[PDB]
Amino acid sequence: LSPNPPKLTKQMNAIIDTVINYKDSSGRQLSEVFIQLPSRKELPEYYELIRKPVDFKKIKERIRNHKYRSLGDLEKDVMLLCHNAQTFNLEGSQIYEDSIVLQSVFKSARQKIAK
Amino acid sequence: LSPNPPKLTKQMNAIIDTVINYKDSSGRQLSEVFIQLPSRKELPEYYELIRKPVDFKKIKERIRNHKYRSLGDLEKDVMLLCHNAQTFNLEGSQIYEDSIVLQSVFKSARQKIAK
Amino acid sequence: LSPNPPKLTKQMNAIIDTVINYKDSSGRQLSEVFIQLPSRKELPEYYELIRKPVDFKKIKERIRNHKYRSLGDLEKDVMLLCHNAQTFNLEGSQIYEDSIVLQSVFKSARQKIAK
Numbered sequence: 001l002s003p004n005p006p007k008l009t010k011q012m013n014a015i016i017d018t019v020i021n022y023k024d025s026s027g028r029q030l031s032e033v034f035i036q037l038p039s040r041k042e043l044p045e046y047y048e049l050i051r052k053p054v055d056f057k058k059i060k061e062r063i064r065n066h067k068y069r070s071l072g073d074l075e076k077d078v079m080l081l082c083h084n085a086q087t088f089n090l091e092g093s094q095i096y097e098d099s100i101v102l103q104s105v106f107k108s109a110r111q112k113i114a115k
Numbered sequence: 116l117s118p119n120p121p122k123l124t125k126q127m128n129a130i131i132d133t134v135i136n137y138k139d140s141s142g143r144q145l146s147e148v149f150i151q152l153p154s155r156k157e158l159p160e161y162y163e164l165i166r167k168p169v170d171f172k173k174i175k176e177r178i179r180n181h182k183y184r185s186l187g188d189l190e191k192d193v194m195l196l197c198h199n200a201q202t203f204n205l206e207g208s209q210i211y212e213d214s215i216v217l218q219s220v221f222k223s224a225r226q227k228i229a230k
Numbered sequence: 231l232s233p234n235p236p237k238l239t240k241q242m243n244a245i246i247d248t249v250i251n252y253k254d255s256s257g258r259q260l261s262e263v264f265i266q267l268p269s270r271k272e273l274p275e276y277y278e279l280i281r282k283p284v285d286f287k288k289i290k291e292r293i294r295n296h297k298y299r300s301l302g303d304l305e306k307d308v309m310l311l312c313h314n315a316q317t318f319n320l321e322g323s324q325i326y327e328d329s330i331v332l333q334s335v336f337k338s339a340r341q342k343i344a345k
């Protein structure tokens with residue numbers, strides 16, 4: 001469980017980059033509303049219903065500071081992001097929809113760079 | 116007797132760049148599964164009944180490393196893939212349809228590219 | 231009312247150099263064609279159509295001659311570059327698409343250093 005190689009760090013990023021920077025057919029960068037969560041004092045409901053919240057920043061941070069040991073351990077936090085999103089949003093609502101798409105992007109992006 | 120110049124580089128790239136990025140009515144890029152083959156370990160059965168397999172990766176290799184003389188060289192690789200993808204996968208099975216869908220997309224991209 | 235600290239000037243160049251330096255997934259420097267405008271004699275067109283023409287050399291030249299006052303003054307010009315590309319070049323035409331990409335990189339460079 002000793003120094004996170006640079007090679008592994010080099011992946012996590014580009015993966016989470018591939019994701020963040022993804023722009024759809026119309027060209028809308030889907031990540032926009034996932035980067036920063038909204039405030040407890042803005043959307044208290046979210047933090048009532050979502051027991052273990054998360055956004056992208058807080059995933060990037062955890063990359064930056066070598067918390068994540070394997071690519072597995074990242075997927076989980078990206079997956080929990082979308083789970084959360086889906087859980088809070090109305091099926092067929094643009095928020096709800098993006099999370100899915102992104103979910104896939106990662107899995108292909110991770111595939112395309114990982115084992 | 117001679118080299119492979121800008122027209123053969125740009126155009127043969129231009130063609131392929133286009134095809135890859137082609138997305139159906141659902142904006143679903145159909146190149147997806149045709150970029151990187153399954154490993155021989157992954158799906159032995161492919162190679163247990165396909166003579167001379169080929170990826171998408173290898174196409175851009177054959178481009179970057181100047182093996183395709185004319186257009187007629189490229190297409191042969193291109194159409195083959197589909198031939199395989201069709202040969203292997205089942206009629207109606209998404210991949211099959213995609214594989215065909217592609218064939219043509221190239222055909223237009225080649226014909227449209229009139230010098 | 232006062233000249234530009236080297237702290238600033240060295241940003242303008244970092245930000246712009248990130249931009250210019252940038253290559254796409256493929257490994258393709260998008261900047262390439264924007265670095266220098268075409269000759270008047272070569273694209274008389276561009277000059278008839280584009281009101282205030284600008285490429286990258288001149289921006290550099292305009293950082294060097296302490297001609298940009300804020301980062302605004304810069305981005306203002308940097309976007310004038312992409313507007314002009316998208317004004318002249320047809321939607322979906324490779325160039326066009328690229329220009330948009332760059333607009334983002336620039337903004338992600340700048341939004342990076344504003345922190």
Ligand SMILES: Oc1ccccc1-c1cc2c(nn1)NC[C@@H]1CNCCN21
Nearest residue numbers: 033034035036037038054055084085088
């Ligand atoms: O589920 C998330 C995970 C990570 C980051 C953000 C969200 C998120 C943001 C949301 C929302 N739901 N989820 N509902 C509507 C609300 C409208 N205003 C923008 C903020 N937004």
Ligand SMILES: Oc1ccccc1-c1cc2c(nn1)NC[C@@H]1CNCCN21
Nearest residue numbers: 263264266267268284285314315318319
């Ligand atoms: O819009 C621009 C902004 C800054 C620098 C260059 C351009 C630019 C270059 C162009 C073009 N359109 N725009 N049309 C295609 C043509 C292909 N041959 C070289 C010239 N090139």
Ligand SMILES: [Zn+2]
Nearest residue numbers: 063064065066
């Ligand atoms: Zn570190």
Ligand SMILES: [Zn+2]
Nearest residue numbers: 178179180181
């Ligand atoms: Zn070469």
Ligand SMILES: [Zn+2]
Nearest residue numbers: 293294295296
């Ligand atoms: Zn000076």
